[PDB]
From a paper:
The structure of apo LdPTR1 has been solved to 2.5 Å resolution. Ammonium sulfate was the precipitant for crystal growth and a sulfate ion binds in a polar cavity formed by the β1–α1 turn and the loop between β2 and α2, accepting hydrogen bonds donated from three main-chain amides (His38, Arg39 and Ser40) and Ser40 OG. This polar cavity is the binding site for the adenine 2′-­phosphate group of the cofactor. Since sulfate binding blocks the 2′-­phosphate-binding site, NADP+ is not present and this leads to disorder in the substrate-binding part of the active site. However, the residues near the catalytic site were poorly ordered in contrast to the same regions of LmPTR1 and TbPTR1, with no electron density corresponding to NADP+ or methotrexate, ligands that were present in the crystallization conditions in a fivefold molar excess. Missing segments include residues 70–80 (the loop linking β3 and α3), 112–132 (the β4–α4 loop) and 227–254 (the β6–α6 loop). However, the β4–α4 loop is well ordered in LmPTR1 but is missing in LdPTR1. This means that in LdPTR1, Phe113, which is a critical residue, is disordered. The absence of the β4–α4 loop vacates an area in the active-site cleft, allowing the β5–α5 loop of LdPTR1 to adopt a different position to fill the gap. We conclude that owing to the disorder this crystal form is not suitable for characterizing the interactions of LdPTR1 with inhibitors.
Numbering used by the authors:
A (entry chain B), B (entry chain B): 5 to 70, 82 to 109, 133 to 226, 253 to 280
C (entry chain A), D (entry chain A): 5 to 69, 81 to 111, 133 to 226, 255 to 280
The structure:
């Protein structure tokens, strides 16, 4: 046993902090990326150097269109974890021009987590009982407006809403396989949300599912 | 003054009833369709015959991909109403194979209403003060599971959630232009929801916005 | 065989409107008051003037405090309808140092419990009526008032009270649904409101229950 | 300068766990009881056994009913911490014919108001402390119990009570945020729970407030 965490958007502002923090706790991290390959590798450099083969970068396109389906690209991201360490215990989902753009950011921000969670669960489902880890938890992040800046009020509230239903609904559907699913949002530092994430992923939080954490 | 209602999915089971009912009340209806052109025209036949030039069918593709954006296809649907009657007072939003499908049904069911509402409001915004109608209301329908049958529990709950936030958020954002926005869902006949829709669209409901109606 | 409506706090302001509006639709009205005799009798006379035997005033303390229990007082008020007219089809619940604090407690409990008990009695009376002898459209409306119109309450205790009342509405809807009794609420958005009341009570709302209507 | 925690209903079952758990983290604990003297003294002795001057029992009636007002009783219980230890940093609120009905009313008001008043007093004490002299981590936890563990309540009145309590949590969080006092809730999903309490009270939750944690 050494547990494994997949942090999507792992080189972004938040994701990195979550990643540093899950790694400090003794998790092996998969550091997901699209655009930011260099920073992925810096981060992987820093952690592996601190503790060897404890981190991998992995590129994945989390957009609405990459013809390869998002459903499949998502399943492949989770697969990177199994190929490389053979388990995945933790998932953290972190003008016409403008309009089509906002609609697409809406789609992947709801649909990527959905498919990343189908995938995560499918694998746990397939792992045999004896060889399953003991503490599977999924955290959906939701963000302030400042961090979804290319936004009007309304679209943001739609995305929060679906994310909100993802969390409560999977919490339920996925309890038979012992998978907790929780959320962290604002609120009506990076170091800060990280402690929440660490607690929800910790053994302390075994009986906690369905819960939308609020922060500041 | 004779008010105008746009009922998307207007030949489907529910939509038709809503349409017959808004028309009985004295609304001129635009009967939206994609696949079901024949039934659109039967319905238009029945109402115009009952009361002349009081109904038009209009085809629109409400899918996620029809390269023409949904944003634009939506704006064009609302435009059909203005071209033909010069006003629009009422909007009613009514295997990899399987997965991409569900993701797409998710996208258009959240995003079509969003863009149908941007469009509706834009026009009202552009109409001059003197020539605006007096009672603009928008109703978002949400449906039982039986009517979104190609579904798992979770996806359905995501869509409800975004729809839910659309309704509350626009209610707010769109109150300066006097546009009420409300929802009708189940519940935790066709004739039945129709009366709710008629009331929310009626002058009786002037001070009602933000409200999610529940039914049975 | 003319429907009967029980409006608590009929004597002054929102109560009167609602009673007046309901009366103008042809219910017989029972106008509860506590301290405002002039107002309840004046109003009842006016109404009885317009249509004979159509209104009565009925006195009750609905504060929270045998010396008579709140339950019994609430049961007798509901009984004053049967006695007088044979039936009761509609209930509208209008909410109305160390010293401020105990009074703010008393108020809180009074606003939650009086409706709770009223709803209990109403419903027990329905259940005692032989099956074939019941009315065809039982509905209950819980009014929530703006923070600004009940000045003795801090933000917190107000929210508490709003929370108790939403619970009762949603709870009682589910719990009474077998007796075909609908329970709904009118509250402020984020005779104005009498039309919503008329609607919820109307035969057109036969399937609306457990709804919190938002009015501003 | 050792932190002090006030647990209502410490005497039996969930209360004891929580007090025990909090105590095992090194708070000084004030163990409220009403009727169960044996339980509160036994437990306090055990704890004081393990570490001297680390626990005391303190008696209070927290029912809803000068003859002493609930407010004053709640103020004095909170005062029994200052008096004894100089400070109070953590509050945990554990909820615990015609006749059943009046008792079910009394219970309801007691469960909403006792916490409300407790939170008032706690917070007044914080505010009277000169600025530079306050503790660094004030937190409040409102426990909600399962329907099954408080048998005297119908579904409806329970939901009412749950609603009052969620209101207080979310309300008091916003209202006390200027005094750097956090308010959160633990409730059932749709020493198990002591770890969540420890967490919410811990320095790692400095930015968590207004959260309803869901535990089953």
């Amino acid at each position: 046993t050494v547990p494994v965490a997949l942090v999507t958007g792992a080189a972004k502002r938040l994701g990195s902090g979550i990643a540093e923090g899950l790694h400090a706790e003794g998790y092996a991290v998969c550091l997901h990326y699209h655009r930011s390959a260099a920073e992925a590798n810096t981060l992987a450099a820093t952690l592996n150097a601190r503790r060897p083969n404890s981190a991998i970068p992995v590129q994945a396109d989390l957009s609405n269109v990459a013809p390869v389906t998002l459903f499949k690209r998502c399943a492949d991201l989770v697969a990177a974890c199994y190929t490389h360490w053979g388990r995945c215990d933790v998932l953290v989902n972190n003008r016409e021009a403008m309009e089509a753009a906002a609609a697409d950011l809406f789609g992947s921000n709801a649909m990527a987590p959905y498919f990343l969670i189908k995938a995560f669960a499918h694998r746990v489902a397939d792992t045999p009982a004896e060889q399953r880890g003991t503490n599977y938890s999924i955290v959906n992040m939701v963000d302030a407006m400042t961090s979804q800046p290319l936004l009007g009020y309304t679209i943001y509230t739609m995305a929060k809403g679906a994310l909100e239903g993802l969390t409560r609904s999977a919490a339920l559907e996925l309890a038979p396989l012992q998978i907790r699913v929780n959320g962290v949002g604002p609120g009506l530092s990076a170091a800060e949300v990280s402690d929440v994430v660490i607690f929800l992923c910790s053994s302390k939080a075994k009986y906690v599912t369905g819960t939308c954490v609020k922060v500041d």
